[PDB]
């Protein structure tokens, strides 16, 4: 069982869930995508704790149980602080790893440049240094889509009709292609997307759904900086990925030494649709870089 709380982290309270480990070897502290979802759909991440990993999870600001704090901090750089913060006021000065899932990547990566002297090693799945190739590689995606389902995408979705059945069908092709390759999702996945649904951070800070990336982050892009972050790194991504491999190449061809893995088969939600392989290619990296 995991510890839950709901302590003050960096002015507005912030729900976290720390498994730790029967032998804890190293701290992995995680970084949910969205932006807006929740650490529900990483849980997967767990089965880390019988590796001697100790996994830290937690909402990131106006995400799942955590308060949603003033629009004015509806950006990364607050989310940052708020990782920082969180990760002193439960660790102090130890060395941690950190990991991030698509927003929670590029998130993770901002963070590694401005503390990556607080990170023994860094972990990026489906991440992103920038938004506009994300959206350019995400456009590619939807052409390459059957027809039917891509004029769907583009008629309604220029019309600003995203209720349209028409509509939906195709964003469940999409995502059963390039979120979550298979059927039966996961509750702690379908959970996660609830909670995006019901807050505001994800419409505002990202947009309607995945690959209409038009809030308030569609023009962020750190790519000229990441190639300050040292520590290990382990990018990864899937074969189908919503955020395609090419984007995880930009981010891998800046940090030096960083591993890229390429999960075939897999979407962006690898984690689930080989949970074991991800779970295990991790708690590798992870105890090589202790």
């Given at each position: 069982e995991?510890?839950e709380?709901y302590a003050?982290v960096?002015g507005?309270?912030?729900?976290?869930?720390l498994?730790?480990?029967?032998?804890?070897?190293?701290?992995?502290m995680t970084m949910?995508g969205?932006?807006g979802?929740?650490?529900?759909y990483?849980?997967?991440?767990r089965?880390m704790?019988?590796?001697?990993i100790t996994?830290?999870f937690?909402?990131q600001?106006?995400?799942?149980?955590s308060?949603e704090?003033?629009?004015?901090?509806?950006t990364?750089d607050y989310?940052?602080e708020?990782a920082?913060?969180?990760?002193?006021?439960?660790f102090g000065?130890?060395?941690v790893?950190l990991?991030?899932?698509s927003?929670?990547g590029?998130?993770?990566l901002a963070?590694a440049?401005?503390?990556?002297?607080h990170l023994?090693?860094?972990?990026?799945?489906?991440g992103?240094?920038?938004?506009?190739?994300?959206?350019?590689?995400?456009?590619?995606?939807?052409?390459?889509?059957?027809?039917?389902?891509?004029?769907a995408?583009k008629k309604y979705?220029?019309?600003?009709?995203?209720?349209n059945p028409?509509?939906?069908?195709?964003v469940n092709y999409?995502?059963?292609?390039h979120?979550?390759?298979?059927?039966?999702?996961?509750?702690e996945?379908?959970?996660s997307?609830?909670?995006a649904?019901?807050?505001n951070v994800?419409?505002?800070?990202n947009g309607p759904?995945?690959?209409?990336i038009?809030?308030?982050?569609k023009d962020?892009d750190?790519?000229?900086k990441?190639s300050a972050?040292?520590?290990?790194?382990?990018?990864?991504v899937?074969?189908?990925?919503?955020v395609?491999?090419?984007?995880?190449?930009?981010?891998?061809?800046?940090i030096?030494?960083?591993?890229?893995?390429?999960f075939?088969?897999?979407?962006?939600?690898?984690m689930?649709e080989?949970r074991?392989?991800?779970?295990?290619?991790?708690?590798?990296f992870?105890?090589?870089?202790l």
């Open positions: 995991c510890i709380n003050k960096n507005i309270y912030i729900y976290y869930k498994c730790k480990a029967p032998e804890e070897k190293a701290k992995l949910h969205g932006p979802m929740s650490h529900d990483l849980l997967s991440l089965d704790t019988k590796e001697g996994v830290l937690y909402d600001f106006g995400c799942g149980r308060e704090p003033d629009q004015s901090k509806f990364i989310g940052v708020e920082e913060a969180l990760r002193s006021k439960l000065n130890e060395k790893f990991m991030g899932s927003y929670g590029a998130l993770a963070y440049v401005k503390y990556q002297d023994k090693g860094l972990i990026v799945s489906g992103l240094s920038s938004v506009p190739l994300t959206v350019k590689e995400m456009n590619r995606l939807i052409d390459e889509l059957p027809a039917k389902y891509r004029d995408i979705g220029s019309s600003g009709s995203y209720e028409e509509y939906q069908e195709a999409f995502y059963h292609q979120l979550l390759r298979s059927e039966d999702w996961p509750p996945v379908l959970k997307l609830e909670y649904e019901r807050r994800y419409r505002i800070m759904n995945q690959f209409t038009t809030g308030t982050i962020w750190i790519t000229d990441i972050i040292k520590i290990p790194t382990l990018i990864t899937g074969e189908y990925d919503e395609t491999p090419n984007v995880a190449r930009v981010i891998h061809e800046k030096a030494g960083s591993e890229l893995h390429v075939r088969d897999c979407s962006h939600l690898t689930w080989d074991e392989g991800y779970n295990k290619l991790l708690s590798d992870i105890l090589k870089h």
